[PDB]
Amino acid sequence: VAGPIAVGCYPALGPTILPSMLYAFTAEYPRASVEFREDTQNRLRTQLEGGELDVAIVYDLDLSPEWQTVPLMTREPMVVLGAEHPLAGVDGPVRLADLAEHPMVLLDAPPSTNHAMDVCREAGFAPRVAYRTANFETARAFVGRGLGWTLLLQRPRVDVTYEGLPVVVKPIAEPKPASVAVVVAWHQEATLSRVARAFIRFVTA
Amino acid sequence: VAGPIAVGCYPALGPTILPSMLYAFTAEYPRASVEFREDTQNRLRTQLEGGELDVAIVYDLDLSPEWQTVPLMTREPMVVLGAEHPLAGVDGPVRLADLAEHPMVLLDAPPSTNHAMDVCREAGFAPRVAYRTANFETARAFVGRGLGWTLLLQRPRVDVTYEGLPVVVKPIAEPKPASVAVVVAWHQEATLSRVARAFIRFVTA
């Protein structure tokens, strides 16, 4: 197992899923050579369907029916709150309806944006978006500071921001939202190289 | 003071500098409203020139002379290593020259990208870039996992990545790299509003 493989992913997946994956794969296969690209939903799609990427690590959301997928993991959406948020202190899951009138910090990084918007709609409201960011950490930092609440698909292991403030992570109820999977994907009509076949098999074992 | 202000910044400044600034400002002036936008280098300049932004929080690197600036803080570039890194035992500062042959994780987020190539260039080398990302946490997470070394202009308060791994931050010497100012900026020819002026005075107080 040797050769070039080009791997893309969403920015939100880069610091959460990718480091351990790339480190472990590359250690297992010293002669493999990985080109790593992070890009937006539309750009990765263009690249992956163009032959620029072998494989892409994406949320299993708004995905072309022509892409093959294999689950890597799956995670419920969570609410994240500042320590002194009115709702940070109550035990159990939060009814998302109870945040309808608290200012939201929207992570607008498609496909996360419409997923958040749909989850709020199933809880029966349109959020007051006080601040918008495409940056995962900016959303977390704004929240830990007390600028609003947010909905996130992934959970950094330590509940603290770049500023050194805590964040409080809550499950969601009424309804309990669907689990969102992260997936390795490729186009149906791609011929997987050996290094690519080896990558998909390793990172999912 | 009351009314809208549009504040832009570079994404890496969004979670580190901006959260407390926006919190403190909106706390002093409950009737001001901030329109917050993170944007890449040309796009922020382009928005500021056209009046879409009142002010920008930026690194003072490669800025137009048309912009008035006031320094908020200054920071030395630093090397960031994973805990198992060959040079992580190095007591005291690293000479960057000592990492010339180790793989680098490059934060490609102008103006950081040219700054970083500029500081290696000055230590005598062109780095071997194993991985490139415009995402700050992706750079820290990759380095914490062992995928290479980086250099960064800012330092999150807790030396831990999203995977819960530590990062080891070291000063650079021989030569010591140039410090970089973070500034509040606005265009020379703008007619500043009362709220924009209040913002500038408030963050430079």
Side-chain angles (χ1 to χ4, degrees):
Chain A
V1 178
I5 183 189
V7 179
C9 80
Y10 299 154
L13 304 175
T16 58
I17 284 145
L18 267 293
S20 57
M21 260 179 61
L22 258 35
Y23 185 95
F25 164 77
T26 249
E28 177 68 44
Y29 300 106
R31 314 144 194 107
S33 167
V34 6
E35 178 186 343
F36 172 68
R37 308 190 185 173
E38 274 167 326
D39 230 330
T40 68
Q41 183 181 65
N42 282 336
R43 289 162 257 305
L44 269 225
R45 177 163 74 233
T46 290
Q47 287 169 43
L48 183 71
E49 300 185 346
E52 301 181 52
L53 264 5
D54 295 79
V55 117
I57 292 75
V58 299
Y59 297 108
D60 194 357
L61 294 168
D62 291 332
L63 231 145
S64 158
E66 268 199 308
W67 288 14
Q68 320 241 69
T69 60
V70 192
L72 246 17
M73 39 108 41
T74 173
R75 245 276 166 202
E76 252 181 51
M78 300 144 255
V79 171
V80 6
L81 271 13
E84 281 158 63
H85 186 95
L87 284 172
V90 204
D91 72 279
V94 310
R95 297 176 63 241
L96 210 48
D98 287 346
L99 295 158
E101 299 190 308
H102 308 274
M104 186 201 194
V105 171
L106 186 48
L107 189 57
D108 177 18
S112 82
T113 315
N114 39 232
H115 166 273
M117 247 28 168
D118 300 342
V119 173
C120 294
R121 193 40 92 201
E122 197 170 330
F125 65 103
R128 320 175 174 171
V129 178
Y131 302 99
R132 265 168 188 269
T133 177
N135 196 30
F136 204 89
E137 188 58 11
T138 306
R140 288 185 81 252
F142 269 34
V143 161
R145 189 53 67 168
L147 294 165
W149 60 276
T150 197
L151 217 265
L152 304 176
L153 270 3
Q154 305 275 97
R155 190 194 174 155
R157 288 291 155 159
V158 181
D159 293 338
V160 75
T161 73
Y162 277 13
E163 288 193 308
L165 295 179
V167 152
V168 172
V169 177
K170 315 284 273 148
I172 293 170
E174 211 192 287
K176 185 205 56 59
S179 204
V180 178
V182 176
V183 125
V184 206
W186 56 100
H187 195 86
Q188 255 169 12
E189 314 190 304
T191 313
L192 258 11
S193 59
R194 264 189 23 147
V195 65
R197 227 142 78 253
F199 179 93
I200 296 155
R201 283 229 253 279
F202 180 90
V203 307
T204 188
Chain B
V1 101
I5 178 188
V7 184
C9 77
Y10 297 156
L13 260 17
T16 52
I17 274 155
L18 268 291
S20 55
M21 252 187 34
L22 269 12
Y23 191 91
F25 179 75
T26 49
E28 223 192 291
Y29 296 102
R31 271 162 282 113
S33 64
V34 12
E35 289 116 62
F36 172 73
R37 327 229 171 277
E38 272 168 323
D39 231 316
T40 59
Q41 169 184 244
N42 306 350
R43 293 174 44 108
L44 213 69
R45 166 177 95 242
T46 273
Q47 291 159 209
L48 202 68
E49 289 282 331
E52 288 181 73
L53 299 172
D54 290 270
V55 300
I57 305 302
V58 290
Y59 308 113
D60 185 13
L61 300 169
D62 310 318
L63 299 182
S64 6
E66 282 204 280
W67 292 14
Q68 291 276 275
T69 63
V70 163
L72 266 23
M73 43 125 78
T74 296
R75 309 254 251 158
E76 259 250 298
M78 72 214 84
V79 162
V80 190
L81 277 6
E84 293 174 15
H85 191 102
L87 278 66
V90 161
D91 194 39
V94 300
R95 16 195 358 266
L96 235 152
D98 295 359
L99 288 161
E101 292 290 285
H102 288 91
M104 184 205 193
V105 175
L106 171 75
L107 183 63
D108 182 351
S112 289
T113 320
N114 288 1
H115 178 257
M117 293 316 190
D118 289 349
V119 357
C120 294
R121 195 174 115 233
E122 103 172 306
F125 71 103
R128 311 176 42 249
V129 183
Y131 301 98
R132 172 185 306 260
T133 173
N135 192 20
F136 195 97
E137 187 57 17
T138 300
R140 294 178 76 244
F142 274 27
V143 166
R145 178 63 63 167
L147 294 167
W149 59 269
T150 201
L151 59 103
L152 295 171
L153 276 286
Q154 308 182 263
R155 166 134 92 145
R157 232 153 245 140
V158 189
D159 287 344
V160 179
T161 74
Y162 283 179
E163 308 184 302
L165 290 186
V167 107
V168 179
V169 168
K170 303 196 118 104
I172 305 143
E174 31 224 300
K176 212 213 200 196
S179 299
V180 177
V182 182
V183 300
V184 65
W186 63 97
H187 197 288
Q188 241 156 44
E189 313 254 5
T191 296
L192 288 178
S193 79
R194 309 213 73 117
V195 292
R197 224 147 109 90
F199 184 90
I200 296 159
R201 297 180 184 160
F202 179 87
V203 307
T204 61

